[PDB]
Structures are given as structure tokens and as C-alpha cells.
Amino acid sequence: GFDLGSRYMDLKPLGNGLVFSAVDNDCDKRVAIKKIVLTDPQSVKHALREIKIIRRLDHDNIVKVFEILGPSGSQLTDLTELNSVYIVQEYMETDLANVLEQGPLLEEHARLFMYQLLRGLKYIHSANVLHRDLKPANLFINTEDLVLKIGDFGLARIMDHLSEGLVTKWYRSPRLLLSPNNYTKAIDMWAAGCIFAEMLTGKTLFAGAHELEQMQLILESIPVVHEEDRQELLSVIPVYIRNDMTEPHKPLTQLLPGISREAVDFLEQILTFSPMDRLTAEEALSHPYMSIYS
Ligand SMILES: [Mg+2]
């Protein structure tokens, strides 16, 4: 119903209305608009890093950016003299989290979406861009075409007051839990493995409520095969978890009951404890299970 600037019309919020649907009046096309509130200098730094990363990305499996708007909704030409900025971008029908709320995918859909996620990751990793917040809610779906696009580069960095409690732990790799300051390509790949499993089952694979429970759940199901890893872990993790990892639990195959052997075998090459053993996005795309799409 509301106008933003001289160009965007019929703004309707898409609980938390900082994300709107709007019509671009120069084309009469539906777009998405994210309002970004510039509160602190830690909020200006997060806005600017996000804007720089998203501007440089054009790929079939990445949400397109159209425009950056200033507080009044007029276009920016290239800013801590500003209370707010808007990001105008491709309107997407839904996100993978909304899809998985209605149950698991057929393997054929999970596989096709995985092939798109990996193609998106190969691209952003080639630009040395780490996403750092891969989860179903940041994977946008057009259901008619079965197109998956990676969006919400809010937490993204060029590889080179935490709000820790607002970051979901479910898609975090063992190395990210042990070494929290350092994002890597391999950390994105671990999250893609967890998202593949969730598409197959409709359930979070490792649903820990904090870092420690997340590590416990991963150790219950994923073996530590390198001595170097085992020694680091033994010196960091508490007694009850160390006890728990010599107790019997379900392996990956039993967390994915009735899923084809080929899907589980592919997944076992992504959900390796060590990133040294883990398929890169490029290696994953060239694995037989995925090369059927190439
Ligand atoms: Mg999101």
C-alpha cells in the first residue's frame, strides 16, 4: 500500500517487517526490498560488507540484486550520514525452510536442489566469498521451475556483543564449533551436507540447542578418523561428551532411514569430521551422484 521513493509502490511486509514485496513502477514487476537499519557502527560495517559482496555476484543460483536505496528510497550511486538503506532484489516465491515445514522432498527434488546449491557454492567460493549462514531459510525456491537460489549474505565475508544466541548451531561444522573466528570454504560445504540430509528426511540432522550439544550430536554419528583431530577434541570437550563418544549411537545411515544408498554414500563424503577429507563444491559436482545433472 505504501510508496518508497519515486519508483517503488505497494510495499507489503513479507512477524518481522524489514523485508517487503513491492512493484517497480518503471516495469510493473514485483521485487523484494530489505530495509537495513543503521543503528551502531557495528551495524554500518555489516551493511557495507553485505552490499559490496552482493553487488559483484551474478549467477543462476544466487538471488539477483537490482538497487541500493538511501533513507528516502532514492537510488545510491557508487554512508554513516544515513539512518537506513534498502536493498532491492529478485522476488522469490518461497524459501526451503517453508517447503520442508510441509514434509521431506522426493530424492529427485532433494538431489536437484543439492546440485543447484553446489553450483551456487562453486561460484561464490571461486570469488573467495564464504556465505557463513547456509541454512534452508536462506535458500530461495521458485516452485514452478524448481530453481534454488542462495540469498541473505548478511553474515558473508571475503575468506582472508556477538549475538551468539541468534546464530543457529544446526549447520555449523565441528571445526567452526572448535575454532569460531575462522570461516572456510569447507564450512559452507558442511552446511550443504546438513541441508541435503534435511531435504531427504524433513528433519534437522543435528539439532543442538548450543555449541556443546551440537558437538555431542555430531560426535554421536560422525567418526573422528585423524589422531590430530582426536587429540584437539580430547583437550577441549568435557568428560560427559568424551564418555558419550564411546557409547553406542545411530550412524548417518540410521539418521536417514529408507534413503537410497547412493545419497547416503555421497553425503558421507561431505559430513567428514575433518575438512581435509571433505569434498569441495567442485569435487562434489564432479561426483557421479551429481554429474548426472552436468
Ligand atoms: Mg534469512
Q: Which residues contact 254 (CB under 8 A, 6 or more apart)?
A: none
Distance CA 281, CA 192 (A): 9
Q: How far is the CA of 100 from the centre of ligand 1 (A)?
A: 15
DSSP type of residue 200? H
SS3 of residue 64 by DSSP: coil
Q: Is 34 marked as binding a ligand?
A: yes
Catalytic residue among 28, 60, 95, 133: 133
Check whether domain 2-90 has CATH 1.10.10.60, yes or no: no
Q: Is 40 part of the annotated catalytic residue set?
A: no
Strand partners, 212: none
Distance CA 27, CA 30 (A): 9
Grid coordinates 516452485 are at which residue?
143
| Distance from chain centroid for Cα 55 | 18
Q: Please name which of 191, 173, 195 lies closest in space to residue 182, comparing C-alpha atoms.
A: 173
Count the alpha carbons within 13 Å of 218 in the hemisphere toward its beta carbon: 30
> Helix, strand, or coil here: 139?
strand
CATH assignment of 94-292? Answer: 1.10.510.10
CA of residue 138 to ligand 1 center, whole Å: 5
Residue 137: name the closest of 197, 96, 91 by CA: 96
Parallel, antiparallel, or unpaired: how do β-strands 29-37 and 84-90 relate?
antiparallel
8, three cell numbers: 517503488
Measured in angstroms, how far is the CA atom of residue 238 from the centroid of ligand 1?
33
Residues 5, 67 contacting (CB under 8 angstroms): no
Tell me which residue of 145, 153, 168 sits closest to 92, measured CA to CA. Answer: 145
Can you list the positions of beta strands (E) in the chain?
Answer: 2-4, 8-13, 19-24, 29-37, 65-69, 84-90, 94-95, 129-130, 139-142, 147-150, 157-158
Query: Is 17 known as a binding-site position?
Result: yes
Q: Is 45 annotated as a binding residue?
A: no
Rounded distance between C-alpha atoms, residue 125 and residue 137, angstroms: 20
> How far is the centre of ligand 1, averaged over its atoms, from the C-alpha of 292 (Å)?
30
Residue 165 counted as an annotated binding residue: no
Q: In what order do the strands lie in the sheet with 139-142?
A: 94-95, 139-142, 147-150
Domains 2-90 and 94-292 share a fold: no
| Alpha carbon distance 128, 126 (integer Å) | 5
Range list of H helices, 157-210: 174-178, 185-201
In angstroms, the CA 252 to CA 268 distance is 8
| Domain boundary assignment for the chain | 2-90, 94-292
